[PDB]
Amino acid sequence: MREIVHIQGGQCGNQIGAKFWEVISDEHGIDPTGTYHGDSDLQLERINVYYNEATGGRYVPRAILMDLEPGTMDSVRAGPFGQLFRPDNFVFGQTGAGNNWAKGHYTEGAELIDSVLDVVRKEAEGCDCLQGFQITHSLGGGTGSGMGTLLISKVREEYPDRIMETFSVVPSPKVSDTVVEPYNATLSVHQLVENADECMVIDNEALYDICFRTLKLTTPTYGDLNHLVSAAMSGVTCCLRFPGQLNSDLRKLAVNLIPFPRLHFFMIGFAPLTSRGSQQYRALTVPELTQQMFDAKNMMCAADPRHGRYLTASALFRGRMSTKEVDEQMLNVQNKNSSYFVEWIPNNIKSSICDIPPKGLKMAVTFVGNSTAIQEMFKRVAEQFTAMFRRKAFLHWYTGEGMDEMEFTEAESNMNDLVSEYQQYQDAT
């Protein structure tokens, strides 16, 4: 039915989806136990395309657990809504990748892929007209990417018609949570540029910036952050989940978002984002949220539209309004800062609306535009990879996995090729 599935690895991402399904449960108001306690059939109408009824009305996720060590499995296993799960999917590891990506990709990569792809495949038979599935990990290591690389390869072959919308955490330029990041990252991204269908960037520092400045929060954790992102990743299917006077699916999205298949790394904007007092400063209009939409500070990725140029831009609106406003602000904005709008893409802004906003708010905005400002991102990470690969720093942890360096060259001149590729598209008219 255009239903989809979720698969998460990732040192964080395993938590991320926990929050995610948590949020969707709220938007479906079904008890933690797994039965519905809401007030409209509309939550039940399209419930299946994420959930699954069970005998007795156990309502369940179409999620897939990735992990190389059960702790997360216990963690979310210790999770509220944990009784809303299926024990089947608790597919984890006994070792951990140690985030040498070769470890999580050959060593443990080849070790535990099979049981996953089997049960996942059983989910594939459980899906009537599968629009797709949602993968989640991080692009700097192996706790997610280790195996998730193998996932994208295997299912991608196994389902060359299905959509692969991939969110994985990008290392911020400043803070290096690990120094093996350039290598895991580069080795992964070689794969992901080939095999993944959609990708959107996952920085932490942006999420900090949001929580601290625009959220005006002092205490950052993951969980709030995954609230902030699963807000958007939860919004994305809204029309696909719920009616909309102007609907567009991921196929309409990506096909209406990408000129050439190498450009499915997208940046993200969601809003509104206030602290409590703000409403008693300000109110909500479509033009208002628009005035956030093109905010670099909501630009939750390491790329700057202020520095790069919008190759593409789009808006995901959930609520009840007048599109006569919506479009009007659209075109207005597409003029107002025309210069950061790429040229030969006429009407490079594109529209949407969901008859219902997310719960709690009256109107919704989402922006997954695609400039080319990410070039500094790849340039950076490739740069650090370059330096220590001059040094071969921690190659020994690496070659101990029994990869070659020439692969590193492959993702290397590879990833540079993708960058310059974005250069010419940005530098053209």
In degrees, rounded to 5, the angle at the alpha carbon of residue 384 between the alpha carbons of residues 378 and 389 is 120
Largest distance between two CA atoms of the chain: 62
CB of 203 to another protein, least distance (A): 12
The residues, any chain, with a CB within 8 Å of residue 66's CB and separated by 6 or more, are 7, 8, 9, 10, 14, 91, 92, 116, 137, 144, 147, 148, 151
Q: Which is nearer to another protein, 51 or 378 (CB)?
A: 378
Q: How many residues appear in the chain?
A: 429
Is residue 11 marked as binding?
yes
Q: First CA to last CA across the chain, in angstroms?
A: 41
Is residue 204 marked as binding?
yes
Residue 401 and residue 419: Cα distance in Å, rounded? 28
Residue 272 and residue 284: Cα distance in Å, rounded? 8
Pairing of strands 4-8, 60-61: unpaired
CB of 372 to another protein, least distance (A): 25
Q: Of 93, 75, 96, 91, which is closest to residue 22 (Cα–Cα)?
A: 75
Cβ neighbours of 285 (radius 10 Å): 13
Is residue 226 marked as binding?
yes
CB of 86 to another protein, least distance (A): 16
CB of 409 to another protein, least distance (A): 17
CB of 54 to another protein, least distance (A): 22
Q: Which two tokens stand for residue 358?
A: 């997310």
Is residue 424 marked as binding?
no
Q: Of 236, 60, 72, which is closest to residue 144 (Cα–Cα)?
A: 72
Is residue 194 marked as binding?
no
Q: Which is nearer to another protein, 89 or 99 (CB)?
A: 99
CB of 275 to another protein, least distance (A): 7
Q: Of 316, 298, 167, which is closest to residue 239 (Cα–Cα)?
A: 316
Q: In what order do the strands lie in the sheet with 318-319?
A: 269-271, 363-367, 318-319
Q: Which is nearer to another protein, 50 or 398 (CB)?
A: 398
Q: Which is nearer to another protein, 129 or 283 (CB)?
A: 283
Burial class (CB in 10 A: 0-12, 13-18, 19+), 9: buried
CB of 266 to another protein, least distance (A): 25
Specify which residues 365 forms β-bridges with: 271
Pairing of strands 318-319, 198-202: unpaired
Q: Which is nearer to another protein, 8 or 248 (CB)?
A: 8
Cβ neighbours of 186 (radius 10 Å): 27
Q: Which is nearer to another protein, 46 or 318 (CB)?
A: 318
Q: Which is nearer to another protein, 275 or 338 (CB)?
A: 275
CA 212 to chain centre: 22
The DSSP 8-state label assigned to residue 7 in this structure reads: E
CB of 148 to another protein, least distance (A): 18
Q: Of 415, 389, 417, which is closest to residue 403 (Cα–Cα)?
A: 389
Q: Which is nearer to another protein, 71 or 126 (CB)?
A: 71
CB of 172 to another protein, least distance (A): 9
Is residue 138 marked as binding?
yes
Is residue 142 marked as binding?
yes
Q: Which is nearer to another protein, 11 or 134 (CB)?
A: 11
Q: Which two tokens stand for residue 240?
A: 């696909």
In degrees, rounded to 5, the angle at the alpha carbon of residue 385 between the alpha carbons of residues 265 and 377 is 30
CB of 221 to another protein, least distance (A): 7
Q: Which is nearer to another protein, 307 or 362 (CB)?
A: 362
Chain residues binding another protein by CB under 8 A are 11, 69-71, 73-75, 77-78, 94-96, 98-100, 174-180, 204, 208, 211-212, 219-222, 275, 277-284, 362, 384, 387-388, 390-398, 400
> Could you tell me which residues are annotated as the binding site for GTP?
11, 69, 138, 142-144, 204, 226
> Could you tell me which residues are annotated as the binding site?
11, 69, 138, 142-144, 204, 226
> Could you tell me which residues are annotated as the binding site for Mg(2+)?
69
